[PDB]
Symmetry: D2
Subunit: 417 residues, 4 copies
């Protein structure tokens, strides 16, 4: 019987198990034998077939029949990337040939899909066929606008639930939370949690007009929101900050971010955007009775059990992977577009400037973004021109209307309106 081998690469996203079971269950009805490599390419990279066999498992009906309820990956995952060396690619080729893998399904990001493509291009097209299923919780794939990636709905819904608790706590015991949403690729996740939870502010890198962000501008964008709320009698709130703001910050901004010290180097993961902003905002606003606390939302989302939307989603993706193999496809991506799962060649989706799959960011000109912005607390262009409002907000911050305008009015050219 033909052998289908499955592995996962990259970080988990809710629904991985749904893709594994969707492919495996359908393949088993066709009489296929299904195996799963543990920890992605980690052990295939050694080329030692005994080591690979000690870290592969038989994906059977009993194993996969009920994993569609569970977050995580039953075959685990890794960022092992055989593409960096030609010897590693040939090790993976040597182990896949040894196992008689006819169909090769990888579930991972592009680094994972590219590894699959590298191993295949140096391999006869009649012995092995290779398909990758693109996974990302960041929702940054180039699908038709408003169409989500699998695992995103789960990550957003649980994030909404955590922020709900922080909104209740911020009101019950007046304080501001700066919630840093993990993920530096795009602003989909931070804005999704913020809009759903009715957070009072959301900052994403996509809304900044100039190419590089300055630390002072981020502090003042949050500062103006806190003062405006205070002008309406509210000394509390929640502001959600996409971690991707950090990767748009200038070199000088990163120097201030790390405590006016030299930034580490091989290192954006050591940055604490929400914490740094909290320290700065407390000096400026503490005298007004404001307390500010950072909170990170990230790792607890990756392996939450999938919500129904992602359970249906990943079942249809697993099916479509087997369907593509049957139709002779290879070097393709299983994606869902306009309700149809279909294979799409890797090159059809690449951005020529990057060599990586094209990244879809938040469209800050769309109506969805402007609607989210309407329900935020912030000072618009029109608001700065309203002298009754500007006087009340300035007074809340114990500064003159001229001082307030002098400091904050420029922010309308910092971010889209």
């Amino acid at each position: 019987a033909p052998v289908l081998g499955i592995l996962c690469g990259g970080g988990p996203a809710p629904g991985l198990n749904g893709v594994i079971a969707g492919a495996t269950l359908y393949a088993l009805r066709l009489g296929w034998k299904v195996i799963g490599f543990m920890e992605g390419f980690k052990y295939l990279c050694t080329g030692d077939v005994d080591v690979v066999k000690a870290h592969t498992i038989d994906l059977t009906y009993d194993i996969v029949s009920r994993i569609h309820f569970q977050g995580g990956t039953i075959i685990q995952t890794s960022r092992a990337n055989p593409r960096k060396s030609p010897e590693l690619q040939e090790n993976v080729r040597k182990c896949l040939r040894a196992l008689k893998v006819r169909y090769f399904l990888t579930i991972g990001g592009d680094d994972t899909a590219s590894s699959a493509v590298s191993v295949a291009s140096g391999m006869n097209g009649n012995e092995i066929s290779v398909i990758s299923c693109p996974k990302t919780i960041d929702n940054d794939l180039p699908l038709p606008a408003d169409q989500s990636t699998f695992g995103f709905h789960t990550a957003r819904s649980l994030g909404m639930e955590i922020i709900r608790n922080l909104m209740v706590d911020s009101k019950s015991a007046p304080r501001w939370f700066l919630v840093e949403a993990m993920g530096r690729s795009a602003g989909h996740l931070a804005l999704g949690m913020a809009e759903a939870s009715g957070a009072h502010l959301c900052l994403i890198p996509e809304e900044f007009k100039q190419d590089e962000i300055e630390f002072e501008d981020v502090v003042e964008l949050v500062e103006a929101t806190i003062l405006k709320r205070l002008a309406y009698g509210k000394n509390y709130g929640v502001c959600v900050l996409a971690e991707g703001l950090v990767s748009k910050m200038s070199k000088k901004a990163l120097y201030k971010l790390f405590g006016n010290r030299e930034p580490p180097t091989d290192l954006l993961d050591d940055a604490e955007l929400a914490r740094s902003l909290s320290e700065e905002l407390l000096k400026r606003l503490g005298n007004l009775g404001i307390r500010i606390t950072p909170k990170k939302i990230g790792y607890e989302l990756r392996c939450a059990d999938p919500v129904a939307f992602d359970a249906v989603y990943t079942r249809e993706l697993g099916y479509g992977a087997i369907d593509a193999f049957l139709n002779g496809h290879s070097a393709a991506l299983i994606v869902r577009e306009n309700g149809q799962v279909k294979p799409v060649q890797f090159k059809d989706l690449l951005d020529p400037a990057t060599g990586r799959v094209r990244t879809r960011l938040v469209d800050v000109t769309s109506q969805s973004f402007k609607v989210a912005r309407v329900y935020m607390w912030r000072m618009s262009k029109k608001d700065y021109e309203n002298k009754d409002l500007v006087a009340r907000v300035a007074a809340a911050g114990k500064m003159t209307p001229e001082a307030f305008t002098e400091k904050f009015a420029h922010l309308t050219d910092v971010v889209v309106e």
Copy 2:
């Protein structure tokens, strides 16, 4: 003085109603509008008494609506009171809306509610009142672009998946079959959504039956063949999801059997009382007579009222926020007799007449498309006897033996089911 926006809810609740109320109210308040909410839909506007209406309307203020986007239900309640059946009632609603000086009238409800709103408007000056309705249904039966859901549907489906998950674990731990009846007779979207998400072993919806009228025996035999096939692979347990809409497709003879070989009940005016039907219970009794001797136990379970007012999931919190906004946007843009709907990520008003089915005069009902790719995928992961399966003699012998019957007896009893449902 400031224009008055009045809001009411009609029909049955769905998760996200409060989100539409908060989106409309908060945006309207930033425009300086005054916002009021009628309690229990058209119930008191139908009386024409302005004192009764005022005793059952409330001022929708910032503090009231600021944090209801987290909460299920309706803070202004709802009702099925329907003024469209009478011109005196329509004129009563007009008399009370004029009295309260409602400039913008937003109804959040089903088809009966939207039709009532337009009827009340056609006898009104287009410069004094403007009317917009927001379409609500957990049944997902609105004529929207395919695969795009109505608000509250995602919440109802996700909670339904979680409940069935408990029943799937319970069915395996203590071998048994559950016949889960999903509430809703309009369409099969909800039953099929929960089943596919939960990996249930079977789903039956009215849309998959070819003939115009379903027979009780056919439904019994579709479940029976599934139980036997699982039993042929050593599994004496499972979950089967049944859309309540199977009942409303059943023939006269099938309904007589459904109600216990009794005359089907009827209301004063002559409508058969399908709410009193107990589909899952009736089928369980029959399947237990046939299969209990094989070691099969079957139990019915209904999933319905606990879904309607669950707190909205994030998808519906965003959805209903954009709808509440879009209603205010439609008022500002001079629209009236329109329905706020979302299409390809864009909220826009769509005229009520544009959505009607010309043959019926009512809004067209979107059912499950059983020819689509999504339905064929759902069907692959179910346990069932397909056309090809009935031709596989090795399989038919294994299943027949599980049911303690000859292979010819099995083929004679169940094989006709391939002409009952689309394959």
Copy 3:
């Protein structure tokens, strides 16, 4: 080689079973023991065929059990196969346990399961096998010190509260009364727990009735008085929780009305089939006849099977970890024919004789103590007509008016209920 510990589950599942399996297994593995698990309780041990038993036993290894403390249900399944009724079966179980060289035998189940384990033990030498059972019940009906719960009860109560919350929001949003029937006829702990936690407007348990047999009319009237009193305060909706055990206290005449003025159903052996009763539905139909004219709609809802295999809450995860440990500790200390129970924060073995009720031969049933302060507190926050209320002429006039009847009629009809239930 290493001592063999065999584990099986009997009876209906309860949240935390897996926690007991993992607590016992992990500790035993640190001791160097070999751990096996029989699938579906005594079902295959009853056959006596050792090949069949081996085909339905599994090696409980570290990797199998390391992360099952999060999961509801039981990974080794369960069954009600009861070898206690036959020694031919008991000796089959003995034959398979000797063949597998089970030194330590742990059963997690109800009274039938614990009794079966001891019967298999009384016919073996005390040196070759030691037997411990962990008593399981989601009904909280074990004779532990008062206010101390059985494992799985906290989870079932908390999930039941969550379901009723959705019904409380739905009952207010779309005015209606829900009759929530909590499944389980043993006791009233579960129904009262969900009701008190959720602030339900009424709860009826068999324990609060003074007389030995309940009458159908009295149950109807106790709910009816609550609906009328709420109606007198402008609320035409609510939730009432009914313990299913009301059915098992009903008189012969009461059961005749319950089943539709028919003879109660019966099994082949003549015993009555109370599972076919629909307590909430029958009361709903009757209450609709009496109160529908007042604007009341009433709907039944069952809460039962979705509770059994919910994932355990933290209280039950810690609880079942301590029980699994205490079973291994009891084996190590030479105990046998004992029950692992937790009392006053201490897990300890308790000999079978300490817990049996001599009248039954089965474990004693702990019911709700309706004289306790906890019950009086729960009763304070319900909507109901007390002794004092019937003597308050101002109140009786408003409630009577809500029911469109004279105060003389109301007192004459309902006043006797103060001798029906404890006050």
Copy 4:
């Protein structure tokens, strides 16, 4: 009619609304008038009766009928502490007499109850035990309300981190909020089957050393590594920080002088215990294939909706508060023992040495703690004496058995065994 005034003090806990609703509903059936002071003692401490009047609300039936489902507190809370000054204490009395409060119910932790009694020595005063830290001196085995909810949600969050730690091999250092005691950290850890839990109660000496904490985590990671597992979750009580010596705090803050408030007291809130330990352990263990990430669990627990156990608990506590008022009790705490709610005089609960409410910590000699410890991964005394085991672990850490013994064996005198 008599006036019952209700306030909340301290940090929020799930079930606050349940006590407000139980007390208010029962009091209203008695014909009482019920008012709620906003933000605890914040405004009563000013002595300005005009300000207090602007921050009190009438607790009515429609307000409280359905808040037993809701986390947080509708009358908010604060840590305003009239106990620190006699001038403040008389301010609270002046405002309460002005409002003619006959019955005064405070709902709060140990800090709150001590404030309540100070106001009383000169109206009837009752306090209800609140704290997710479970650190009130209640009868043994009886929890404070809100503890069950905080622990159950904490278990659920850690479950997601456990699935993520195995799926994408890594160690999470979960910092559980609360420096008072170890109840919360040990509860979440035991329920979630976490691989290690460190609480201040298990340390023998009066002062913890930073190196000892690092090494307690290090030995657990190496032992797991000796059994083929390069991942896990370790739960750390924040109270480890408040036991650390002056030198341990210097290393904790980055070999900095610890921050301090204007009075000379150290600012432990600025400490990042889990983050600091992660940095140190990554330097030592990164080469072995170990990744370590810190995660804090705290503020998202405080205002979760109450679980059924806390809903019933706080319903009975609110009732018992009114019943104590009816029976003439004062300066008492409503507590539950053996299913009976009863008032317990405040003097019975004082620490003769401290004058403040006694703080109940984890009893590390109890059977519950010994069982929890059995299911952890750690090196006991007997384990350090097992030469076969010591060789296996030492090899996992790429060190000789002599090096391992010299570094780690002393830890048996650092923590109870």
